[PDB]
Amino acid sequence: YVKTWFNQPGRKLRRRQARQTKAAKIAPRPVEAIRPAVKPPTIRYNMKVRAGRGFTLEELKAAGVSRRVASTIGIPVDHRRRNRSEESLQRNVERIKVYLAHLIVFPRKAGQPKKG
Amino acid sequence: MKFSRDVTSSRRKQRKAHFGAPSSVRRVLMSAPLSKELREQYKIRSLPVRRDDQITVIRGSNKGREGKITSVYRKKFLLLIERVTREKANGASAPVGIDASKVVITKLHLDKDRKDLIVRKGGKV
Amino acid sequence: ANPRQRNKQRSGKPRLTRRNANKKAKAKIYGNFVIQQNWDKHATLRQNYARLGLLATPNYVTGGVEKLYPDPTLDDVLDKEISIAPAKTEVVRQLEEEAVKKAARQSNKMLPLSAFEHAYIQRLINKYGTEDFESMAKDVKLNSKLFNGSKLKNLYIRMKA
Amino acid sequence: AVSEKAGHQTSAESWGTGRALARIPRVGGGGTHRSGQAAFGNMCRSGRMFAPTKTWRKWHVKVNQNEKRYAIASAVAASGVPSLLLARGHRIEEIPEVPLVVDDAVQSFQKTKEAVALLKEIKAYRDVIKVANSRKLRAGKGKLRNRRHVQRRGPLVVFNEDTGIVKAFRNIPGVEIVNVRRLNLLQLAPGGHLGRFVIWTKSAFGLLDSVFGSTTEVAQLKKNYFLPENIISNADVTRLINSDEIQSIVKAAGPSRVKR
RNA sequence: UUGACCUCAAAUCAGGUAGGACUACGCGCUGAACAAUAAGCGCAGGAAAAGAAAAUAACCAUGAUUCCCUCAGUAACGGUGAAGCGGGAAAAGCUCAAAUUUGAAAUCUGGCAACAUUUCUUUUGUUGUCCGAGUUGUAAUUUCAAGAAGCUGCUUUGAGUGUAGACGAUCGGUCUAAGUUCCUUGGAACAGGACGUCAGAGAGGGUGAGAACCCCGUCUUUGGUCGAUUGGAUAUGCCAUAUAAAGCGCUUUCGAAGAGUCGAGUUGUUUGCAGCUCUAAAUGGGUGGUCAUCUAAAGCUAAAUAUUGGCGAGAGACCGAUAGCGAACAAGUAGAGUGAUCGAAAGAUGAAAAGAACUUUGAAAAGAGAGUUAAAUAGUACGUGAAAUUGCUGAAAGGGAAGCAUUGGAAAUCAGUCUUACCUGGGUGAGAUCAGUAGUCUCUCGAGACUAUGCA
RNA sequence: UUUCAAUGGCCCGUCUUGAAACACGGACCAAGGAGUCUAGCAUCUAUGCGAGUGUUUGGGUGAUGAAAACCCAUCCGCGAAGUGGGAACGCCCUUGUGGCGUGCACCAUCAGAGCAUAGCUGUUGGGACCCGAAAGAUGGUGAACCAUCUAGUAGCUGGUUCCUGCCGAAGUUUCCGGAUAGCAGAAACUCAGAUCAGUUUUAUGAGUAUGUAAAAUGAGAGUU
RNA sequence: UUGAGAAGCUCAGACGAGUAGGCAGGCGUGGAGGUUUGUGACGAAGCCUUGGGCGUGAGCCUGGGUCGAACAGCCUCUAGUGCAGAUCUUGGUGGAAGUAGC
RNA sequence: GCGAAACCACAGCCUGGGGAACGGGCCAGGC
RNA sequence: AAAACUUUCAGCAACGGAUCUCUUGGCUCUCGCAUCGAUGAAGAACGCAGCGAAAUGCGAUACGUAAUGUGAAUUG
């Protein structure tokens, strides 16, 4: 079998139309969730900083965001990752704190019974 | 140039659509211009032909002839106009088919459906 | 060529033609009305987010960015408090203005007491005063539901207002 | 590409060697004239054509991005030479100037008759009339394949920002409208021939320095791009050969074509 | 005994559900030859599968799955051939078993009766009541990332039902620029020439020959308009079983974690898997380099991915009727074979049938006189009509070959051409690029175009 | 053009064979009918940039087709890791002649050149120039038959399509199917004040010849 | 002296078999980009011809006839691109033959 | 009266010599 | 040696269907979508078209009925 790439420009267009389709549904919030900053796990790459999967629970507790609130305002949680050093904790705590500064959370209507 | 991806410029698909068209489409494919008097009085440029329509032949050997449309032959996309015939071997008169775009409508067989059509297509009466 | 596709070629029945081909046209915006009004339909979502002053991605972009015109320490990270951010556009100000005003409208968080709740807390207060909530919770006769001091404190607070 | 089973749909076997006939397999069965007819071969009727065409032939070809920028720069330079425009088939004999730059108010034309008036005022409509007259029916099987007509190329209008210039010019036969930021070699050297008649707006011409840069200064819109340098500074070889510096040290020329 | 419970049956009892087909892509099982190979068998969906670590690593550590690029034709193995990292696309997390609700089976199906609701009189529910299920365990709560129970004071809250409008999606209607002016050729003008128009429309097709302006359309339309069916929000009225339910915080109190499995021996298939014999543990067990990491033997899950089938669509440096699908047409047809299976050849009169009336010969088929057509050198043996081949006619040649070459003759037949212009007058008038001339226009004084006048 | 006269003229292709003899293929005409596509490798040329180089996995963008063109974030691949002769130049000065210096590349004596693309050629895989050899296996139908794997396997058979021009062998030493070499070309080098020869001599010797060394004749030669 | 498509023009001498093989330049075909302000119902393409011409050749131009709707030169791109053979494939058609014979 | 098929490079007098068969084509003689 | 017969050439008539031109077909690529069946599917058979060459359509309501839309056809 020989795989051909004639749909390469048609996949590019289809993926872009999905981003536009996604943005139409969720109008003002970002098309991606904020990702942490981590360091790759080798002696070849540990100097580089890249994006992680989600923020650790210890990073969210320091930033002031609970693990149940976090998912609702676009902050992924990684229950697996941990902070073995204070630099990873502070690098990503500041990342969450900056995110909260630039964030507008629209209020939600709440059911409110008469008494009690 | 056409910019819609919903319309085909393919000669294969354009010819198949025209020659395989159903009767309710050939009614629109068989349209004729109106005379200048009707065109600037009904505010309509062209209308589909119909029986009892009074037309003038504009092109062909029979150019200049006039008469009512006895019947429209939608199978072959032809009009049959009264007194526009051809003599056969035995002297019987065989009518000659004329394309609907080769005639001009000098008088309209007005009906309520066509009267509604005129006011629909920006016209007046 | 297929017997099924040849069958509808040999038939007189028309195809179930559906004219849906519309490329280069982008999805129309719903959800937020403020974004919809200020969203143009020709520009991309990156161009519209930037024009409206929002961020499409809180991360890096995995490619180039268009250039249309030539350009002319844990204590201080944990105890710090970032001073929010200014609104670069009138749309962002419009979004921010709506959020604060609506939150102010929906701010009545304190709750009243029902007939049972009021009579419950009132009877406890008439015997143990208003400051001794620990002995209020330990009275099995009047505190049948066995509410602790913190629940009884919140009951009294809601009764005050 | 042809079908992946064409010429092999039938069933046949080799009858044998020495039976006074070619040993090509002949279709079995009976009742149909296929009995004894050969297949599975280029020569045999309804047989497999030799080396069936495949879809994974290399259709696209890579060029270094720097060569592409060189070609587009060299094709833009060729569009500022009136002789190269004439030799490519453009009727620019009455154009006031080359390069032909027009005001930015052209960028907001809305009607085609506004565009046609401008082309007639700068005498650029002689090229459009050439394109209209050249429209012929294409020769060959190309016109069975949605290539019905052929014609020449008109002026290439290059703008900076669009305010109706594209819609006001697109229906004029031959005229192609492009943005200065994405210049196309298919449109700057049609057929591979240099010297396209290009009309610029004032804003597009002012943005050419940022698109291409200079031979010493980097382009603003292309990261780390410099215009190519030339193997010769002055390309008038007659000027070097017939110069005072060179003609003063050459030995006395022998005759031209010599006597027998 | 009555009577409960457990069984074992029965009913044309009520309500359901499975089969077969397709199978391009998908997931299992099975399997030869020349490899998870074709076949064979089983089972799905719009995707499937996989999937929230008994995962990598050895780092400053990473963090479900899937796909792409790279790692890499590398390690390893014996030519086969990965994976970790790295770069992208997409991102979403969760549900049980193991706890006493024990101050109250708090849970559920069904019958019946009302009340609603609908893509829908076809759909889907609500409330009430009775019966059954269920304590050999149905709810709430918990899933290790934890959590429970207490305590504390901060922050929280709808599985309700209408109305209105806006924003989207889907289906069906509707709205839409300009020559058929003049001359020539022609059977026909859609050709050529002239003079015009429209152009957000100069795509394509049709019309008696190359049609932007004759017609359908195309552009506007990345929309106005009229309805129909819908989705997520907004605003607002009413209702709200809150004596409730959550997040965070704090501890002189607690914290269950899946077995004929893991694993060991051995035998087969292709390490995994499978059989057989044996058969566990509790900081235990797995996988790695004392240390690190994970937490199996239970379950669910969109997106990125695949797609020779199905419902449509738009295209192409493709083929052009011995090609391209076997099939451009009565094509899986005719036809063949007991059957499995096999399987063709075959497109084009003309603008219009105007498809040859009528007379005549003949038993008839047909023929001849006519007739239609621009054309019958277009007559359905139908566009063009090559070669091989055949008949007739004419000319030439010809003792058992032709045969080709070279050079000429003869005969036939062609190209293959001409004096018509130059020079020098004179006469006559003619007029500009000539005026002992006057104006205008376009370039730049004088350069072109003209106008008036004179023709010395 | 036909025909006559004079002179000449064995049937084409394939294989064979010094050669033919041969044996093959050819009733005739039309149409079809065979070195293709692709992956890797190496040489050479062109093009871009150059201690760098490569945009197209992807993202951005592209209103006039938007599968094009245009733009580039992070990676990654491949690279980086003194004396003589001599090209060229200046200065002379008996000026030419020569000398005095400066000496690239490269060879003798003791101050990175890559990377990408395109084309050419060679080569290895895929069906692999085309037609050719009994099959075997799987699954069916009534030892047989049918369908697929299959374009299975070929060192062998037959065939393999336009023109002109310029070069042009060998058909065999030697070791041993071969690696050499020879023959024939290409490129880069150094040279005509240099060498060379199916050459003839002279003479030294050695035994009419012989080899060697150094005069005539011819040609510019030697290389890698 | 005009003779600079410097890829041109020009002067001189020598030389000419050729298989395998090496090299160079050309002819022709289908389609593509460009061009000829190209040809065509006052006749495109095709075919026919003891018409004429050009080229060493592949081939090309043209008259006449037939015909009826398209087509070509130049630069570049591309490939299912050139036939006398394959006991080649398909189709048509001959001599054997009005024979063998029924 | 109805009517094939095999086969088919082209041919069809000898005599000699022609070295490779050469006679059916070639060379000198008859026909 | 003329005829016949044979051969060659040309004219005309046959034979054949090449070539050319095109073409509601194929082939290839890309894009959108998710929809069979015990409520009887796919397939097969037999019937109905005033005639239809077949082919198509349909099912005893048989080349369809109801409803909606267009608005005057059908056609050999």
Short mmCIF file of C-alpha atoms (C1' of nucleotides) in Angstrom, two decimals, chain E residues 3 56 167 228 244 410 416 430:
data_model
loop_
_atom_site.label_atom_id
_atom_site.label_comp_id
_atom_site.label_asym_id
_atom_site.label_seq_id
_atom_site.Cartn_x
_atom_site.Cartn_y
_atom_site.Cartn_z
"C1'" G E 3 -50.71 -20.84 54.44
"C1'" U E 56 8.24 6.36 30.68
"C1'" C E 167 -28.04 35.14 17.07
"C1'" A E 228 -41.48 25.60 8.12
"C1'" A E 244 -31.56 21.00 51.79
"C1'" A E 410 9.35 7.99 -77.33
"C1'" G E 416 7.33 28.88 -66.84
"C1'" A E 430 -2.91 70.06 -61.14
#
